[PDB]
């Protein structure tokens, strides 16, 4: 039995070219103790057709993201703890010029 948690950071982000370089946080509810270590898992589930790929899973709170062609980006983040397991989504919508 593994318990649950809350992932909430947005879900629109709505960035626009040329300023495509964005990073996504990993706000956790509720307040974790200082001993419990979290493991993260960022996975790209949708991306534009001309997307190159420089997003590989950092397993960390910071997700760097570069070379964004305009379109819709969806990231399935998986928050895994010692006795806690939650997940969240984020829609990055990059607009053209």
């Amino acid at each position: 039995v593994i318990k649950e948690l809350v992932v909430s950071a947005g879900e629109s982000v709505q960035i626009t070219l040329p300023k495509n370089e964005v990073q996504l946080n990993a706000y956790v509810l509720q307040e974790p103790p200082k001993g419990e270590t979290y493991t993260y898992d960022w996975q790209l589930i949708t991306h534009p057709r001309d997307y190159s790929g420089e997003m590989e899973g950092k397993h960390s709170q910071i997700l760097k993201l570069s070379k964004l062609t305009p379109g819709l980006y969806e990231f399935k983040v998986i928050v895994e703890g010692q006795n806690a397991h939650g997940e969240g989504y984020v829609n990055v919508t990059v607009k053209p010029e």
């Binding site: 949708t46 534009p48 190159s52 790929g53 590989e56 062609t69 305009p70 379109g71 819709l72 919508t93």
Partner: protein
């Protein structure tokens, strides 16, 4: 024959043999035990404010095989060798063969999901070759064989929507129920296999050539016609006539006419000067059928979006694929950069564009008092002497469709493209047989506790295609599907560092060119 012997080999190839190509394709499938082995009653009312979405129907535990897309049989190189060399193609035969069945059994005990295989559990497969079931294959649904051969796909659950009542979720007395265990099905252990052959009926070749010549410009521009046109009237009411000159195609006499039309809205891609913040539902072309009104994309054959090199498309008229398969039931707002928005620009010498009016006709009778007046129409149906082009088939699009068993029909080219079949390939249904759990006493109520289990295995599909050979005395080179990318960051129609199959652009068939 038994558990320690392979019940079939991996056939996945293509063999071009003159004006004929066989295309074999083996895939690996997973079959979940859908519905926990029972028939259910799926029904809905008006969602999204539209009672068109209200249905009544039944969902079965049966899964099915849907190899009704072109990439399930064709690699993109063998598709390129087809659409750059041949004027036509049509299927001739078919050979499906399910093999290497193995059925696991998941046993979640104290959150330790042990997955072992039972050698004794069976799998039912029948094929519906009398066409007695609702044929749900040729409708543009998911669950197909993948484009890429080492991908493992899950078999889609078989459901069907029967007649509801008064655009509600309630049935009518004509609403039927088809039990699928009332059909004889072959029980398959782990050493058994299921073969099946099929011969396609006589269909026309798909015209995989673009026109080299406009429809209203079929005369030569050198000699002029022996027919005159009414040009004007004099100061009296006396009519006047002029000879149709040589290259004046705007006022020559025409012998053939374009296809059907219904004017759809044209939206600008690329840069775009589109109307901002449009809820595009209330202004689409609908076709009200027995109560509610339905969006009907794409509109029937005989039109085109996208003239040539213009960023205006008729998005109601087109086939919009995604680049990758998506999660089911998603409400994501995709953009232009995600989709494969697919142009029909190659057929513009014969078809009329869907975001423009097709012509104009006289609205009144003229006189010395009333001047002549014309009025533009937004839709024109079949006129005798018409000629249009069928919808282009794509590598990512459907192969066939079933004509509905009604009384009559007019020439059954499916609006989504492909081959209209009266007797299509029969729908191969498949399920896991229910294995009961621990039942220690007799009760007249049926068993509802089962061993939770899934099965997996391979399926091979061997189609055969008769091809129409290109024969043209055109001098200059043609346009063909070349692999033209400027600074590729990835090989297209091939995986990436993640390992997912990356497609960027849809591939048509009309690349050869041919005069009318």
């Amino acid at each position: 024959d038994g558990v320690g012997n392979a019940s079939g080999d991996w056939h996945c190839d293509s063999t071009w043999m003159g004006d004929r190509v066989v295309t074999k394709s083996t895939r690996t499938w997973v079959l979940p035990s859908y519905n926990n082995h029972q028939y259910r009653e799926i029904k809905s009312g008006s969602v999204d404010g539209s009672n068109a979405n209200a249905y009544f129907g039944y969902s079965t535990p049966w899964g099915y095989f849907d190899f009704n897309r072109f990439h399930s049989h064709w690699s993109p190189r063998d598709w390129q060798r087809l659409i750059n060399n041949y004027w036509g193609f049509r299927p001739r035969s078919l050979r499906v063969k399910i093999f290497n069945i193995q059925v696991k059994e998941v046993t979640v005990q104290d959150s330790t999901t042990t997955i072992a295989n039972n050698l004794t559990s069976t799998v039912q497969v029948f094929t519906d070759d009398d066409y007695q079931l609702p044929y749900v294959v040729g409708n543009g649904t998911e669950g197909c064989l993948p484009a890429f051969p080492p991908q493992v796909f899950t078999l889609p659950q078989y459901g069907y929507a029967t007649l509801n009542r008064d655009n509600t979720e309630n049935p009518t007395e004509r609403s039927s129920f088809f039990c699928l265990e009332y059909f004889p099905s072959k029980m398959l252990r782990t050493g058994n296999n299921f073969e099946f052959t099929y011969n396609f009926e006589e269909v026309p070749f798909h015209s995989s050539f673009a026109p080299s010549q406009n429809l209203f410009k079929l005369a030569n521009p050198l000699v002029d016609q022996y027919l005159y046109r009414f040009v004007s009237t004099n100061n009296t009411g006396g009519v006047q006539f002029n000879k149709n000159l040589a290259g004046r195609y705007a006022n020559t006499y025409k012998n053939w006419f374009p296809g059907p039309m219904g004017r759809t809205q044209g939206w600008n891609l690329g840069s775009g000067v589109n109307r901002a913040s449009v809820s595009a539902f209330a202004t689409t072309n609908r076709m009200e059928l027995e109560g509610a009104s339905y969006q009907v994309p794409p509109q029937p054959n005989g039109m085109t979006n996208n003239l040539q090199g213009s960023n205006t498309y008729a998005l109601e008229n087109t086939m919009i694929f995604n680049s990758q398969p998506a999660n089911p039931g998603t409400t994501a707002t995709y953009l232009e950069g995600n989709m494969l928005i697919t142009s029909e620009s190659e057929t513009q010498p014969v078809n009329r564009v869907a975001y423009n009016v097709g012509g104009q006709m006289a609205t009144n009778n003229q006189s010395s008092t009333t001047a002549p007046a014309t009025g533009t129409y937004n839709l024109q149906e079949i006129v005798p002497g018409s000629v249009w082009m069928e919808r282009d088939v794509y590598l990512q699009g459907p192969i066939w469709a079933k004509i509905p068993e009604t009384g009559a029909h007019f020439h059954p080219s499916p609006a989504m493209g492909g081959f209209g079949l009266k007797h299509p390939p029969p729908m191969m249904l498949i399920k896991n047989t229910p294995v009961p759990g621990n039942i220690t006493s007799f009760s007249d109520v049926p068993v509802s506790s089962f061993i939770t289990q899934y099965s997996t295995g391979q399926v091979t599909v061997e189609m055969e295609w008769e091809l129409k050979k290109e024969n043209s005395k055109r001098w200059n080179p043609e346009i063909q599907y070349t692999n033209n990318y400027n600074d590729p960051q990835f090989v297209d129609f091939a995986p990436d560092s993640t390992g997912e199959y990356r497609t960027t652009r849809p591939i048509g068939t009309r690349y050869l060119t041919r005069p009318l």
